[PDB]
Every structure is written in C-alpha cells, then in structure tokens.
Design a protein around this ligand. Structure first.
Ligand SMILES: O=C(O)[C@H](O)c1cccc(Cl)c1
Length: 279
C-alpha cells in the first residue's frame, strides 16, 4: 500500500532517504496487534480512529483527554491518516492529568495495570506500550518499566527534551526498554532531543502532524512524538511476524537506516527507524 502526501515522518520511516512524501506499508497494517498509549488519555470518538480506540483505565476524575497530548500520540500510532499501524487496536490509560502532569506512583500503577490487563485482551499478534512521558531519575520508575517489558509487552519510551544525556531521566534510562530520540525532516537530531548511550533508536519528532482533541489536528514537536512512531512500527512488524515483543527493539535497531543523522554526539547510536518495505 502507498499513502501519497503523507506526513513527513511516515514517509521517512519507509524511505532510505529524506525528502519523500509517500508512506509505503504492507496492507496488514498492524491488524491483530494492540498498543497501550499511557498518557493524558485518548479522544476515542475521533473519526480518525474508526472505532479502534478505547479508554480502559483512568487515575483521575474523568477518562477524557482534556489536553490533546495522548490523542496526538495515539494518532501517530494508529489513526487512519496520521498513523504508522493503521489497523492496530488502541487502548488508553490516563496517568497524566489534563495539564500534562502526574506523580510517579500513578505512572507506576499504570504500568503495572497494563502488564495485567493485556491478559484480558485479544491481541494475537502482540502487545506494545507507548510512554511519551518521563522525569528525573527514579529507580522505581525504571523497575516498573522493566517489569512491563518482562511481562511480554514491547515498551517504547521517550528520551526526553532537555538536550542532555538521557541517563538522568526515567524511564528513558532503563536499559531493557526501547528509548527513542527525535529527528527532523532534514535528518538532523532535533535540537531538543536527549542523547546518550541509553538511546536505542531515533524516530521523527519535529513538526509531527496528528490528531488532536475536538476532532481536530495539529503539528507539535518532541521526543513524545518520535516514540509512537517506534511503537507503531513494532506493532506493524509483530503483525508481519518479523519479531516478538522481547526482541522488537533489537530488530528495529538491526534493520534501521544507519549513519544518516547529523548532530549525533559521540556515544549515541546513529540509527533511524525504518520499515524496510519492498513493493
Ligand atoms: O524534557 C522533559 O520534558 C522531561 O525531562 C522528560 C523526560 C523524559 C521524557 C519526556 Cl517526554 C520528558
């Protein structure tokens, strides 16, 4: 399948070179996989989700996304126009309030919840968790992310947006999950993107068009936007049978575009997510 005039990030992950505008992808499109979007919630009623999105847990008064951030991330995972894996099932876990804030205890609870809840869901091709959030180093937060990964869920987390070494941020610094940095349309590291040896992969993170609350769309930047590209790619590759939850991060790094990025400091991988599609 080919999506013409696609958002640049989708085009980038199906091309060996920047500047293209077509997203090439296999028609299976992540069907039969499931991605938990752990964030401010999802506007499940957005037409772009076509009924494939559902809220399953909230830690606040409402399960509604009153912010937009979680809806935007879910859209890059799996909306029809803006999504990597256009047929995957989306589950929303609201651990962040509508201001975008949330305590570590609630984020840990949300991670423990997914590890259990997935056993209740029909996801024959595998389960992914997308965490476009973080804060300062916490061993408890890292441990919760490691537990979620250990339970059989591919965990993708944002590296952070401080132009600093991600080793001082959580869950970014957990070695066993898949830590995602941000790139822009010119194949530079985004100026805000954290870096360091704990990074596993880069994805498109600057000026990312996706869904927003009120049935709208908008373009925003962050390693929060790169992470759902990698989460959706994992779901897509798991449906194709190319990898499992335990090894999808490694497989994505093995098959990435290598050496293409600029502004990569010594010690950081130069790898850009790539779906390797061949018509
Ligand atoms: O840069 C920040 O906003 C925070 O430090 C941070 C850390 C880790 C992940 C995210 Cl999305 C944000």
């Amino acid at each position: 399948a080919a999506q013409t005039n696609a958002p640049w990030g989708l085009a980038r992950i199906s091309s060996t070179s920047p500047g293209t505008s077509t997203y090439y992808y296999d028609e299976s499109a992540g069907q039969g996989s499931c991605v938990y979007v752990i964030d401010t919630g999802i506007e499940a009623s957005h037409p772009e989700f076509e009924g494939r999105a559902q809220m399953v847990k909230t830690y606040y008064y409402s399960s509604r996304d009153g912010n937009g951030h979680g809806t935007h991330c879910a859209g890059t995972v799996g909306s029809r126009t803006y999504g990597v894996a256009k047929k995957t099932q989306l589950f929303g876990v609201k651990v962040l309030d509508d201001n975008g804030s949330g305590q570590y205890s609630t984020i840990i609870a949300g991670m423990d919840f997914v590890a259990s809840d997935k056993n209740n869901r029909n996801c024959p091709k595998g389960v992914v968790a997308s965490l476009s959030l973080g804060g300062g180093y916490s061993s408890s937060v890292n441990s919760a992310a490691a537990r979620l990964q250990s339970s059989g869920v591919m965990v993708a987390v944002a590296a952070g947006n401080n132009n600093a070494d991600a080793r001082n941020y959580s869950p970014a610094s957990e070695p066993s999950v898949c830590t995602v940095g941000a790139s822009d349309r010119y194949d530079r590291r985004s100026s805000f993107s954290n870096y360091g040896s704990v990074l596993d992969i880069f994805g498109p993170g600057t000026d990312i068009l996706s869904t927003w609350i009120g049935g709208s769309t908008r373009s925003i930047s962050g390693t929060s936007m790169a992470t759902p590209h990698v989460a959706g790619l994992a779901a897509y590759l798991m449906t194709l049978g190319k990898t499992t939850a335990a090894s999808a991060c490694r497989y994505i790094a093995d098959t990435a575009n290598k050496g293409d990025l600029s502004n990569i400091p010594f010690g950081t991988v130069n790898l850009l997510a790539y779906n390797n599609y061949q018509a």
